[PDB]
């Protein structure tokens, strides 16, 4: 009866495709034909943040848009004050292989993870001095690719074991395990309302999970390679996925289908990191060609190029106030980029 | 104001302490070499980690790291065994390693093609084009014990062994049959044909047949690492 289930799966997939085709009344490029072009946007490196030894794999901005946490492959988590390019804390890490870092929205805890399979949560505002490992979360049978804090107590971590998870820091145990991805879950982003989160995997898919319920609401397909960068629209009703097919794609939750594909013939490298500006008009995508590209989101025009990194730009993040964009590369450098009037 | 001035002075003092610690860490980091152990499950890579963990000290959760001191030169070996069989995404964490020790079973003849395909994949990665591979053809004793005993001729797989002669260079061990040499160097020549028929001038493959003597293996790793360091110094000096 396996053949019967396969036939039923094919029929349901065809039905969903037909529903999507019915819902595709027009193409986003048609509605955004009348938009005045964003113009050539040229932001400069306001501050270069040096001090890391090995490559920088992931960075996260704090809610105050001033402190940023950076993970390096040498085993270092540095909390930089972007305004004065001064390092506040330099946490040594047990396992040097770090691929994710998170700043708690409360600005108290810093998360890290990687090839050690463990999400290490570090308390910064301790009763005493120094920075110590507040908690270590184990239970993921794969490399931790992205970890994000919901509150000061709950953290969602996506791992290479084709699984995302929700952890209670105090309990130290998984509360809800999100399964259904076939490939390794690489990037994970939360909605502005921390109710749903969309996770991109290596199976050329993204999935919209409900945090409390624990079920995969929708699955978005369309990429031809690994979705290795995810980022919610500031509205919360769309997201952007960067893949190794050298394409970014704007998927939409309500229509449950792609809206538009940002790609160019010149670029053949995969996209490393994807971030939406505060207004959602700009998609800053990091590429393997040692530079970032700023696309228009509503149109598909390449608004700008953030050249200035020697190696691939591994991490990219816009601040909550949108005033700056930090791009960290494999050359042990993060650069803050800001636009000049 | 005064309070702001005191806060900025404190921030600069913390930054200075962090910079001192980072300078010390940089000294240690440049004093240690990164070795990534890759190979099949039948290959004895874990045996290698244990062999040099209890020979010069070592650290001792997924990654089985170890750190030792061979003639004052620090080495940081590590094996990633806690992950899944998909490796296109975490292998990228090892682009700056000094070397990749690829341990090959070299005694089963069934997974040898799988080993060659893995070697090709490692050799051709954009993130591993600049990384030299120290190839450790392990299980030489078993290779011999099967080659003399007959039973399963190697010619069944890899048909080119029918039209293969022992390389004129050669280096047979004191007591050894010519057939053992031919099989051994045929496997090594398959690996070197995979290595050389690709990017040159950025990374090299160092072949070594693993023996029961541990000191020879550690010496080969040390010598290969020294060659890699000298070659990367040549490249950074623009004399290559």
């Amino acid at each position, epitope marked *: 009866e396996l053949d019967q289930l396969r036939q039923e799966a094919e029929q349901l997939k065809n039905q969903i495709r037909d529903a999507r085709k019915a819902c595709a009344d027009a193409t986003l490029s048609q509605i955004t034909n009348n938009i005045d072009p964003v113009g050539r946007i040229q932001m400069r490196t306001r501050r270069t943040l040096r001090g890391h030894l090995a490559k920088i794999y992931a960075m996260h901005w704090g809610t105050d848009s001033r402190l940023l946490v950076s993970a390096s492959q040498d085993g270092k988590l540095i909390i930089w004050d972007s305004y004065t390019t001064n390092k506040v804390h330099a946490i040594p890490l047990r396992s040097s292989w770090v691929m994710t870092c998170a700043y708690a929205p409360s600005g108290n805890y810093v998360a890290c993870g990687g090839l050690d399979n463990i999400c290490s949560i570090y308390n910064l505002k301790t009763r005493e001095g120094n920075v110590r490992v507040s908690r270590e979360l184990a239970g993921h049978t794969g490399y931790l690719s992205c970890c994000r804090f919901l509150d000061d107590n709950q953290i969602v971590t996506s791992s290479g074991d084709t699984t995302c998870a929700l952890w209670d820091i105090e309990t130290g145990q998984q509360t809800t395990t999100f399964t259904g991805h076939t490939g390794d879950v690489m990037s994970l982003s939360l909605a502005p309302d921390t109710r749903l989160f969309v996770s991109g995997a290596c199976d050329a898919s993204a999935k919209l999970w409900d945090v409390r319920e624990g079920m995969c609401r929708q699955t978005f*397909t369309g990429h*031809e390679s690994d979705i290795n960068a995810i980022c919610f629209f500031p509205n919360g009703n769309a997201f952007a996925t960067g893949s190794d*097919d050298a394409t970014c794609r704007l998927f939409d939750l309500r229509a449950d289908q792609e809206l538009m594909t940002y790609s160019h013939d010149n670029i053949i490298c995969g996209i490393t990191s994807v971030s939406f500006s505060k207004s959602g008009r700009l998609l800053l995508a990091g590429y393997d060609d040692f530079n970032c590209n700023v696309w228009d989101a509503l149109k598909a025009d390449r608004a700008g190029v953030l050249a200035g990194h020697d190696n691939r730009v591994s991490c990219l993040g816009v601040t909550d106030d949108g005033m700056a964009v930090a791009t960290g590369s494999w050359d042990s450098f993060l650069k803050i980029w800001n636009g000049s009037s | 104001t005064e309070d702001q001035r005191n806060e900025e002075k404190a921030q600069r003092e913390a930054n200075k302490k962090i910079e001192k610690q980072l300078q010390k860490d940089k000294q240690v980091y440049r004093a240690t070499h990164r070795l990534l152990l890759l190979g099949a499950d039948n290959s004895g890579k874990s045996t290698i980690v244990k062999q040099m963990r209890i020979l010069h000290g070592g650290s001792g959760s997924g990654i089985f790291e170890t750190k030792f001191q061979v003639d004052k030169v620090n080495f940081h070996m590590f094996d990633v065994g806690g992950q899944r069989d*998909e490796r296109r995404k975490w292998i990228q964490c090892f682009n700056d390693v000094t070397a990749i020790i690829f341990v090959v079973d070299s005694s089963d003849y069934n997974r040898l093609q799988e080993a060659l395909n893995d070697f090709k994949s490692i050799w051709n*990665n954009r993130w591993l084009r600049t990384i030299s591979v120290i190839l450790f053809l392990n299980k030489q004793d078993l290779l011999a014990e099967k080659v003399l005993a007959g039973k399963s001729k190697i010619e069944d*797989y890899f048909p080119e062994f029918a039209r293969y002669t022992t390389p004129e260079d050669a280096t047979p061990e004191p007591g050894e049959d010519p057939r053992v040499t031919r099989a051994k160097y045929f496997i090594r020549d398959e690996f070197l044909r995979i290595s050389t028929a690709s990017g040159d001038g950025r990374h090299y493959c160092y072949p070594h047949f693993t023996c029961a003597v541990d000191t020879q293996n550690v010496k080969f790793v040390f010598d290969a690492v020294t060659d890699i360091i000298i070659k990367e110094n040549l490249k950074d000096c623009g004399l290559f």
Partner: nanobody
Amino acid sequence: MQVQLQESGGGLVQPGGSLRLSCAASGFTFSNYKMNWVRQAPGKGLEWVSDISQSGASISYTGSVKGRFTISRDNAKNTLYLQMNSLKPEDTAVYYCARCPAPFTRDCFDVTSTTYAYRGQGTQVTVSS
């Protein structure tokens, strides 16, 4: 759309026969993806068999299929072909076509993995007499 690779062909064939396995791929630009053929023998793991590059210039095989089998890559029809000459009982296996991970690359790893996204369901080739 979804990455799909449907394989067709394969069946009971007497030893020494020939058979064409056709993998029709949809959902991606067939042109710029190195493509492999991987089989799985019963009671055994997945073994890479052949690979062909984007333009078709580079074709590589294993020892057991060095001269017997051939690989074709029709870009216009978005199809891959494995021609199977002088079949042997050692070839009784489930055959899959694998679009290896990244475009414009030949350094692709997870083609023989236990779980792999861009791999077809496959066709069962039995060479029972």
